[PDB]
């Protein structure tokens, strides 16, 4: 018997901490919805080259940081260190693109060699978005909006800043980046032009931007995207145009747990079911899957493994229910479960049938 | 150009959405037992997978995904989750004299030959509970996925069968006898006392919750770390290679990994499985249209009044789908792209329209367009789409 750690810079992601997880991502997508853009799921694998003719080679992230690896078949792969590349490619191989438009987003990880610190994990994960089809400065204003949305359904507008800049400067590009500045101001987005702002990734052509926090709730950066309508065609297909860009969901929640503490998730237990007593489980879990018929959307958890009242009703505690729907003996013989607001410590005896309405009331 | 390792598929716009849609009623029954989301590392040292697996085992011996790190450790994409989350519970300290019901999702990576239910890259959603004994939690394990079933409606689709393999002295004892026969050429004859009763209880446990299942003396599993309880959701429409579901106790795993000994159950299911055996018996389980609202609005100047008006329609409307449209085009080209969506209302936006403060609002569906001042949109659209 020895320990086996994780991979250091790998997290897990406690029960408590996914909690807010869950809450955040959800507003995500639910904002994603209410632009119209659709989910595509792609392979946490690829073939090597992808990112090399991608990516760039000169580029640090080709240079030192993928994870790659050969195959029982020679073929050398990688664990992919961002998605864009294999959106494209799953675009091209399913024949989405060509003559297309396509509004998606993505989640899930990525993979970097890197020496991790405050926001630089090995594996960390990203809410990316992209869009094909459009070349005008419009969509690239409709996906600054839609970050800033975030923000403000996140709480945290005031914290974070917007960086802008054409790396094309030639006149087709400045007439492009004229209009996306000028849809920002109508907007009323605050932004800010920065000659020096270049991507790591050498895919971008116009567009490229980035919001940054002082908080380090990030390393800086939280999100950052920009166009590529050169991408497409240089993997192999027909010449389309394309914008998007991605966000390190470490750095969002990092940020969000800090510009307002006030954040929490619903606690994981409404009602916990005690029960003790010969034969009272059988009833007890009856019970529960009743009341789960009929209360749909509460968490009840069943006690199992006996333990005498108090044991349980500190379990209870434990959880966080706000009441508890007892049963022994008695309760099971009679037709009747006790229900106790554990805020109040007032119970009373119910008859089965109408426990669920009882709970309804004390749940609000 | 390049395509996708073989083995390894895209989820495109189109199933993805009946993916969300089975995923979050999972979610939701998982939900409604109590249960934590776990979230744990898809790559981890490869012992652990050797240690807990076992070494004689077909996932070992032939399908993990190893490989070096720059620094000479081994590495393993996951083939399974029990493991990761085994681990990952000692290392915390959430497993001794604690209680924990988790529940994870995501990726699990096996180098078999695709068939029509196996793939290298495919998904699963595991449950495992910490410090529970008796056949009570098995029994609500059980219990759990029954409700799954009938909540995605093919319920009669799936059977339950189940067996106990006792403790480690009743398969150190079957071996003689087993092994004797081999050589020369059932497993219920050698169960110790102690795991009669606990899959007795069990049964006694599911025959109340009228649960039907079938007793299978052959049925162990493929990993090496399973002790009494043992189960496999199986469906007939070859929805899978056959089992959808399976699971069953690891009481010493916890011990073995280097922890203080803990009771612990699972089982992990398929997605791809599940989405297929669901698509199959349900031949209409239809998801909603990713666009309700769609957009058009052409003339000088109008895309700043258009994404405007948008903005101002989504803190108003909030859950609708409302796609602006970009680039152009004839109001022809337009209503078709909102064919294309799915959208059954498009609110037009022309020259005239922001001018005289307006928009039209053409129900797509029936054709009828009407012109609304913009405060009266949402309310509007609202009745539209009841
Ligand atoms: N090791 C790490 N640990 C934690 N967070 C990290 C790590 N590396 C990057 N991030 C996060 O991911 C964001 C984007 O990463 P990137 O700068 O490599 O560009 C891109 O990935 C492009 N794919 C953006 C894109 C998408 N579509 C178009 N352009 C960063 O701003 C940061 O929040
Ligand atoms: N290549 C594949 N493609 C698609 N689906 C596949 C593939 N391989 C396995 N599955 C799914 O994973 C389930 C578990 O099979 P397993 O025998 O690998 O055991 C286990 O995973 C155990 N660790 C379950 C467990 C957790 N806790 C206790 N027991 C199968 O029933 C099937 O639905």
Redesign the interface.
């Known amino acids: ?7 250091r810079g ?6 408590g901490e ?2 807010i ?2 809450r955040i991502e959800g507003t995500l997508k639910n904002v994603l ?15 090597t ?2 990112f090399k ?1 991608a990516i760039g080679e000169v580029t640090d992230v080709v240079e030192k940081e993928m ?1 790659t ?4 078949n020679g ?1 050398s ?1 990688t ?1 992919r260190p961002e998605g864009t590349a294999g959106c494209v ?2 675009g ?3 024949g ?1 693109l060509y003559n297309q ?4 987003w993505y989640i899930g ?1 990525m ?1 970097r ?1 890197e020496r991790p610190q405050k926001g630089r994990y090995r ?1 960390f994960h990203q809410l990316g978005c992209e869009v094909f ?4 400065p ?2 690239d ?2 996906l600054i ?1 839609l970050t800033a ?1 975030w923000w403000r359904a996140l709480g945290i507008s005031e914290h974070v800043t917007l960086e802008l800049n054409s790396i094309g400067l030639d006149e087709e590009s400045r007439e492009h980046f004229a209009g996306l500045c000028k ?1 920002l101001e ?2 009323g987005i605050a932004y800010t032009v920065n000659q020096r702002l270049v991507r790591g990734l050498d895919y971008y052509n116009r567009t490229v931007f980035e919001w940054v926090t002082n908080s380090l709730g990030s390393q800086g950066t939280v999100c950052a995207g920009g166009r590529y309508d050169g991408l497409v065609e240089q ?3 027909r010449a389309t145009p394309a914008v998007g860009f991605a966000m390190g969901l470490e750095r969002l929640v990092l940020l969000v747990q800090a510009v307002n503490p006030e954040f929490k998730a619903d606690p ?2 409404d009602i916990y079911l005690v029960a003790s007593g010969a034969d009272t ?2 009833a007890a ?2 019970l529960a ?1 009743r009341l ?1 018929d009929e209360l ?7 006690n ?2 006996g333990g005498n009242f108090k044991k349980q009703f500190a ?1 209870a505690d434990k ?1 966080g229910a706000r009441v508890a729907v007892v049963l022994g003996e008695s309760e099971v013989a009679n037709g009747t479960a006790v229900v106790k607001d554990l805020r109040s410590g007032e119970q009373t005896a119910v008859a089965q049938d109408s426990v669920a309405a009882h709970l309804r009331t004390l749940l609000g």
């Open positions: 018997a020895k320990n086996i750690q994780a991979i790998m997290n897990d992601y406690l029960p996914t909690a997880w869950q919805g209410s632009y119209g853009y659709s989910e595509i799921r792609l392979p946490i694998v690829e073939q080259p992808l003719r994870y690896f050969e195959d029982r073929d792969l664990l490619r799953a091209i191989e399913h989405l438009e396509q509004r998606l990880p993979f060699h594996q089809g459009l070349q005008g419009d969509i204003a409709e909006m949305r849809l109508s907007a993997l192999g297909g994981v237990v489980q059988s879990m009856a899957e789960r749909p959307g509460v968490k009840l958890m069943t199992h493994g379990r959880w």
